[PDB]
């Protein structure tokens, strides 16, 4: 068994949940030697360091996958979202907990992967850009099985939405959710950026992709779907430059 | 001498190192000595050529432009006449180098530039001119020259190198990024706006180079081709990335063309064929 | 067996640095830690 | 697999014939034609195809195109005949 | 003036010389280096990470299915897959190992091959993964396969087998591009017993195959990669 | 007298048989410092380290000589041949014992010489290759007095089948069998190769040439022939990479 | 001082050093002091010029090719037009060097290359162009350029040297063989096959060199002759061999032409003539 | 700049000069040297081996 | 009487090595050993 209690939140797992810590680096507060911004940072309490559960996706036999961008997915989550909107600068790690349970008769394999600087490709070619509204979808994320939109990213999971092949996505910190073996995946993400702290609104530090690799095969007569649930907790979050609340599109 | 393989005999191990769980996302270091009886061999190898400094560290042609030395009297657009040419420095225009760099998310390096100028006189010419090229490094955002003999070329601050055509110039530029490393990938915008460009950012501005032939005109026209070679040195790279599989379409974007050919080769035979 | 004098005042002018001795792939190959030994700060 | 063109050719005694060696491998290291005849590699760009002008063919010969490509048969024989 | 004699090669531009050069921005102070996780010193560090093999590259287009090795129930003494071991070609060309390998001409060392079973928990299967060292053909039956290096894999709570392909060569280095002399042998997988699915389940279950390098891996002579090409300079 | 006993084999010589050890180097097992292949090598017992006698050649007044290639000549010899076919890699030294006895009335001189990397010339010129079947004849070897064959090597002993003159073949490890002096020649060959171990099938490490230099002159009325017998024992033989038995042509 | 000969007087030796048995295959070191009364002399000689490093160790022209600088518009086969030329590196094409190297079975050395480019303008020309040559070392098996201005020339990995015509380039290449030494003789095949090539092997692949004139075309045609000089250094040689007696016919083969002339000179007189 | 005076012979290619030169394959690690018997250091070593004389060169 | 500084990092760039001191032809001229003194391993 395992239990992680953050603030007033607790996730219990009857699987021996082994966590991937991206690049063997725990989230940490910005040290003095690396700091450039002079303002004393705001280090929230239990109020933000807690598990936020996103709305669940349904994993069907023909689903391509889902993509969330952080910290965008948590921009509307309790006190963390408010702080992210009221401050000019922010950095944060994350504990991502992807949950998908089935029976011993189901088969299927999810690739849960964290991509730093997952710059999305546009489906239009040339030098078209993916619009802000599509790269900042929020807690719903991007569904790779939906159709293309004007200004939206390309959605061929084979190419990771960026022109690289799916098979190679294991170079990034990842865990598989193999329905025969495990039902949960845990990845601890540190703050990754070329700058010590950054604007939480205009830049997504990491992207969480949950991709079915081995397709869902439910037992005969079974409902042909499984819910996938993502639970995220900000870790070692800092905010700097409090001011009027930012105005973003959508 | 570093050992590559250790002598290992029959093993009736209960700590099976060959059964694992890739569900965890770790590549457990299983060695040949774990699944087969091995002899003891040595590496005889340091891996000097796989260090990022060497892997990303030889001079590559990153820009080519042709400029002309000709009578400039009675020309409005000197740039169109190819009397001079400027180029925002970037290592993305050549795909070999771009893919190598894009194997990493963040890259920090100093730049060593080599500019090769070669002259050609296609039309009738009585001799080959002794031309001098001015390669002016303009800092990011600084004004580029607007005409061939503009006063921007006589800038008291812009680094400039004068060299003969047919010869080379060499000069190093330190790492000039604002952030601690160049963002070879940027999943963001310059600011929170609905219509603003995605990905392409000013963080990765490395400067710009302007080129002209300093000489006044001769009786004939001389075509000068300028090849800029960039060599990255003192290289630091972070966050390995999935290699590029599809063609590129633009600088600073991960876009690929529609209707691209399949990357993965199809098998001549079924999955069992060798 | 080898000699270098620095002829220029800038660090950017020096030749390439050479090889990073301390190379260790466990950052990428073994990033798994048990979260029940409280390794987190 | 290694290939030779033509598969077969009938040519007059002492004449010249152009024999093409090709591989499926895009980048072969060894690619040539084995023959006792005097030959001349035609200046041609690329790595996986070669053309030879085999001059002064006097007898029935069997020039063999060879390569190090491991796909399929790494050698291919063509059959030259002389008529006189 | 110190009497000097200029040697041949004076004034040449060799693209790999790496000498000191004057700085165009004297006295410039670059941004300090902050700690960024995941620093890469050597490419031999990253090739040791397993990535998926598109072993089932039998499709007209690139699909996720290219990575799924089908397993069928009630197959006896039968072959699951078979491939040659030209790591810079074929099924390996697109993997991380193959991609980094295509940037070099020579390679030596052992490979780490992994299989992950993705079928239902209540299934059972014993597979035999065989490495046939060079000199012999690709095995056409399981008996032939099991005479070489092989691992009998019992699928159970541990869903992953890791077989090492030991460096098995006379010559100390092999060419990354396919060559007869520097052939690396063959890799095949066979049903040891069979695949048995539980009741109420039917169809194909799948294996995922991964490739990576052992810590004894070597790559020597840098070359251009033939994976990406361009005919025209790119712009913004 | 002299006696060499290897396994269940023994060669006795009433001549004070002095052995040539090529380049003053005894056969040795591959040391760790030189090894590249990681597999634990198979070092056979008495089963292979023993004298194999090849079929005898007849030395007539007009015979040009004979050539054997190792390890090809022993590919069908008891357990050694089997191991050579079942393993991917192999290295071995050899003790070669050439035997030719006559009376004190006979005259003639054989040159017994070991040539490493005796690449044969084709009799056709140009760039024609000698085919596998001719360079891997087996225990019968190559008879230099026979006629040329399509794809066979040139057979003018004056040029050593390689374009070098016969007189100069003494630079290689050799012994003469001078019928007035001695009837046996013994050469101990170490493993010679640019690689520490190699494929025993596709590459012949050494070539044994027995060449009449001074022609056989039998006494009046005598039978105008002598038998020449070659006896070889593998020494410090190693095999690596066991697998299905190799398939070679002929 | 090393003694060449020792003083030696009359000898009534029962250990006759001058009677031996060449049947054994040993060259017993019989000295002048053994058969004649000698005086004491000194060597005054180290044998520095017979060391393999010196014997096989001066620069020799190993390839010569002519390339052209001309208007390339409307040409399909640039290689045929001699706009560029490539050459698989080998030291077998020049017979002096080949015979010297073939005195040994295995040879290991680093390569120092000197490329001399010389220009000629046979047809009417108004001046001599200031041309620049690109000599590109392509690693073994790497793709050679297919046209004069192919992107292969802008390879971010292939070593390239740019130098003026009339001048030289010099660069060293380390020993690049797969095995511990080059196989100047190989008695084997790439694999066990009935039809495969004999002798010639990929073990001895030293790379390849591609050459082009970087300059665009002038009004006239310039013929550039490129001479590649190879100098072996840090030479190690094993297994001395019988010297080559007959002409060569191909690279990598020991074949000699049919109906060759006798090597051994015939005596003007009988065996007794001086 | 260190004041220098280029001497005659500057820019000449003498085929026997034997100086240092830049490497085209920086950081390349050649195959280790294994023990091969019959190493030749000097040609004065091999001329000391007897070879046959075609003394009867009357054919 | 003579001086060399290594100007390049690679061993392949150094000038020729010079003379192999320890030259001994007995490898080739005296390769005979009695096999009855058990010199073989």
Swiss-Prot record, chains C, I:
<protein>
    <recommendedName>
        <fullName>Capsid protein VP4</fullName>
    </recommendedName>
</protein>
<comment type="function">
    <text>Lies on the inner surface of the capsid shell. After binding to the host receptor, the capsid undergoes conformational changes. Capsid protein VP4 is released, Capsid protein VP1 N-terminus is externalized, and together, they shape a pore in the host membrane through which the viral genome is translocated into the host cell cytoplasm.</text>
</comment>
<comment type="subunit">
    <text>Interacts with capsid protein VP1 and capsid protein VP3.</text>
</comment>
Swiss-Prot record, chain D:
<feature type="disulfide bond">
    <location>
        <begin position="21"/>
        <end position="65"/>
    </location>
</feature>
<feature type="disulfide bond">
    <location>
        <begin position="25"/>
        <end position="69"/>
    </location>
</feature>
<comment type="function">
    <text>ICAM proteins are ligands for the leukocyte adhesion protein LFA-1 (integrin alpha-L/beta-2). During leukocyte trans-endothelial migration, ICAM1 engagement promotes the assembly of endothelial apical cups through ARHGEF26/SGEF and RHOG activation.</text>
</comment>
<comment type="subunit">
    <text>(Microbial infection) Interacts with major receptor group rhinovirus A-B capsid proteins.</text>
</comment>
<comment type="similarity">
    <text>Belongs to the immunoglobulin superfamily. ICAM family.</text>
</comment>
<comment type="subunit">
    <text>Homodimer. Interacts with MUC1 and promotes cell aggregation in epithelial cells. Interacts with ARHGEF26/SGEF. Interacts (on T cell side) with CD81, CD247 and CD9 at immunological synapses between antigen-presenting cells and T cells.</text>
</comment>
<feature type="domain" description="Ig-like C2-type 1">
    <location>
        <begin position="14"/>
        <end position="76"/>
    </location>
</feature>
<protein>
    <recommendedName>
        <fullName>Intercellular adhesion molecule 1</fullName>
    </recommendedName>
</protein>
<comment type="function">
    <text>(Microbial infection) Acts as a receptor for major receptor group rhinovirus A-B capsid proteins.</text>
</comment>
Swiss-Prot record, chain E:
<comment type="function">
    <text>Forms an icosahedral capsid of pseudo T=3 symmetry with capsid proteins VP2 and VP3. The capsid is 300 Angstroms in diameter, composed of 60 copies of each capsid protein and enclosing the viral positive strand RNA genome.</text>
</comment>
<comment type="subunit">
    <text>Interacts with capsid protein VP0 and capsid protein VP1 to form heterotrimeric protomers. Five protomers subsequently associate to form pentamers which serve as building blocks for the capsid. Interacts with capsid protein VP4 in the mature capsid. Interacts with protein 2C; this interaction may be important for virion morphogenesis.</text>
</comment>
<protein>
    <recommendedName>
        <fullName>Capsid protein VP3</fullName>
    </recommendedName>
</protein>
């Amino acid at each position: 068994v395992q239990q992680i209690t953050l603030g007033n939140s607790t996730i219990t797992t009857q699987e021996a949940a082994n966590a991937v810590v991206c690049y063997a680096e725990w989230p940490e507060y910005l040290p003095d030697v690396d700091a450039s911004d002079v303002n004393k940072t705001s280090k929230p309490d239990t109020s933000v360091c807690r598990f936020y559960t996103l709305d669940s996706k349904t994993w069907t036999t023909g689903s391509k996958g889902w993509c969330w961008k952080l910290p965008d997915a948590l921009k509307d989550m309790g006190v963390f979202g408010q702080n992210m909107f009221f401050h000019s600068l922010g950095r944060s790690g994350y504990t991502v907990h992807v949950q998908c349970n089935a029976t011993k008769f189901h088969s299927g394999c999810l690739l849960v992967v964290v991509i730093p600087e997952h710059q999305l490709a546009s489906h239009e070619g040339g030098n078209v850009s993916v619009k802000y509204t599509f790269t900042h979808p929020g807690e719903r994320g991007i569904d790779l099985s939906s159709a293309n939109e004007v200004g939206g990213p390309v959605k061929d999971v084979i190419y990771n939405m960026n022109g690289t092949l799916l098979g190679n996505l294991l170079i990034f910190p990842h865990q598989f959710i193999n329905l025969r073996t495990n039902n949960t995946a845990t990845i601890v993400i540190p703050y990754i950026n070329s700058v010590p702290i950054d604007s939480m609104t205009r830049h997504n530090n990491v992207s969480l992709m949950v991709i079915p690799i081995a397709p869902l095969t439910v037992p005969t007569g079974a409902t042909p779907s499984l819910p996938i649930t993502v639970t995220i907790a900000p870790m070692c979050t800092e905010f700097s430059g409090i001011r009027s609340k930012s105005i973003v599109p959508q | 001498q570093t050992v590559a393989s250790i002598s290992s005999g029959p093993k009736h191990t209960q700590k099976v190192p060959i059964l694992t769980a890739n569900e965890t996302g770790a590549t457990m270091p299983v060695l040949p000595s774990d699944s087969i009886e091995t002899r003891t061999t040595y590496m005889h190898f340091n891996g000097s050529e796989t260090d990022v400094e060497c892997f990303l560290g030889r001079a590559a042609c990153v820009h080519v432009t042709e400029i002309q030395n000709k009578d400039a009297t009675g020309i409005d657009n000197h740039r169109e006449a190819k009397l001079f040419n400027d180029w925002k420095i970037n290592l993305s225009s050549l795909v070999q180098l771009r893919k190598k760099l894009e194997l990493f998310t963040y890259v920090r390096f100093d730049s060593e530039y080599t500019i090769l100028a070669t002259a050609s006189q296609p039309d009738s010419a009585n001799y080959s001119s002794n031309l001098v090229v001015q390669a002016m490094y303009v800092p990011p955002g600084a004004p580029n020259p607007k005409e061939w003999d503009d006063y921007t070329w006589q800038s008291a601050s812009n680094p400039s190198v004068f060299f003969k055509v047919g010869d080379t110039s060499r000069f190093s530029v330190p790492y000039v990024g604002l952030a601690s490393a160049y963002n070879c990938f940027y999943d963001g915008y310059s600011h929170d706006d609905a219509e603003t460009q995605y990905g392409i950012t000013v963080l990765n501005h490395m400067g710009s180079m302007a080129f002209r032939i300093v000489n006044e005109h001769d009786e004939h026209k001389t075509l000068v081709k300028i090849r800029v070679y960039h060599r990255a040195k003192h290289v630091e790279a972070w966050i390995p990335r999935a290699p590029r599989a599809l063609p590129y379409t633009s600088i600073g974007r991960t876009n690929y063309p529609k209707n691209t050919e399949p990357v993965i080769k199809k098998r001549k035979g079924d999955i069992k064929s060798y | 067996t080898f000699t270098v004098i620095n002829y220029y005042k800038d660090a950017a002018s020096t030749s390439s640095a050479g090889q990073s001795l301390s190379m260790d792939p466990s950052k990428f190959t073994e990033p798994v830690k048990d979260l029940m030994l409280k390794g987190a700060p | 697999q290694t290939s030779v063109s033509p598969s077969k050719v009938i040519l007059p005694r002492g004449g010249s014939v152009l024999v093409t060696c090709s591989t499926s491998c895009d980048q072969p290291k060894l690619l040539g034609i084995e023959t006792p005849l005097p030959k001349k590699e035609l200046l041609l760009p690329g790595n996986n195809r070669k053309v030879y002008e085999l001059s002064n063919v006097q007898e029935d010969s069997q020039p063999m195109c060879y390569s190090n490509c491991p796909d399929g048969q790494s050698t291919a024989k063509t059959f030259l005949t002389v008529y006189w | 003036g110190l009497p000097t004699t200029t040697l041949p090669g004076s004034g040449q531009f060799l693209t790999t010389d790496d000498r000191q050069s004057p700085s165009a921005l004297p006295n410039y102070e670059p941004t300090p280096r902050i700690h960024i996780p995941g620093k890469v010193h050597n490419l031999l560090e990253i090739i040791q990470v397993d990535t998926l093999i598109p072993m089932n590259n039998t499709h007209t287009k690139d699909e996720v299915n290219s990575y799924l090795i089908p397993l069928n129930a009630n197959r006896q003494n039968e072959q699951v897959f078979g491939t040659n071991l030209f790591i810079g070609d074929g099924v390996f060309k697109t993997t991380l190992l193959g991609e980094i390998v295509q940037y070099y001409t020579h390679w030596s060392g052992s490979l780490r091959f992994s299989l992950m079973y993705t079928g239902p928990a209540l299934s059972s299967a014993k597979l035999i993964l065989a490495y046939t060292p060079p000199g012999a053909r690709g095995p056409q039956d399981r008996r032939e396969a099991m005479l070489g290096t092989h691992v009998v894999w019992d699928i159970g709570l541990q869903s992953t087998i890791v077989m090492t392909i030991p460096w098995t060569s006379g010559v100390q280095f092999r060419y990354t591009d396919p060559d007869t002399y520097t052939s690396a042998g063959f890799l095949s997988c066979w049903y040891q017993t069979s695949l048995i699915l539980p009741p109420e389940t039917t169809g194909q279950v799948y294996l995922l195959s991964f490739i990576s390098a052992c810590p004894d891996f070597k790559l020597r002579l840098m070359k251009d990669t033939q994976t990406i090409s361009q005919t025209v300079a790119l712009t913004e």
